[PDB]
Amino acid sequence: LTEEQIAEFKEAFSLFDKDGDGTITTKELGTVMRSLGQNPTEAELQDMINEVDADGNGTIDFPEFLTMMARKMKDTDSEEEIREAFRVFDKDGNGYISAAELRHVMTNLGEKLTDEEVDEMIREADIDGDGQVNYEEFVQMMTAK
């Protein structure tokens, strides 16, 4: 995480940590959201806290806030990159990569596959057997560790 990022996250934390004690509680989170409209319930509030409280100690600290903000930024970044990667293949933008599309993409990028190898590449990813690669199928390819 850059200084820039941390500093944005510092401000975001401050907004919720009304008293500045380094910790965000449910009362605090209510008071702030009410200072701003919102009107949520002690149910809603307890959950929001639990979803982020890694150590279970009952409130959110900056380290835990930071982990949550990092994950969400990384998650979104990945999603947007994978969508972009998909468009490099899905030439006509219809949501499916056909064998024909893959083959011509291969030629454009200066790669060298035979037609049977193009088919292997489609089959590899084609979880549902329709003979094409949709977006979720593609994600598994780009996610492979």
């Binding site: 975001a12 907004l15 919720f16 989170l29 959201m33 701003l36 409209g37 919102q38 903000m69 969400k72």
Partner: peptide, 14 residues
Amino acid sequence: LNKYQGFIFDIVTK
């Protein structure tokens, strides 16, 4: 909610 409010509320609702 407008986007400004939405951006704030998502910090903790997302």
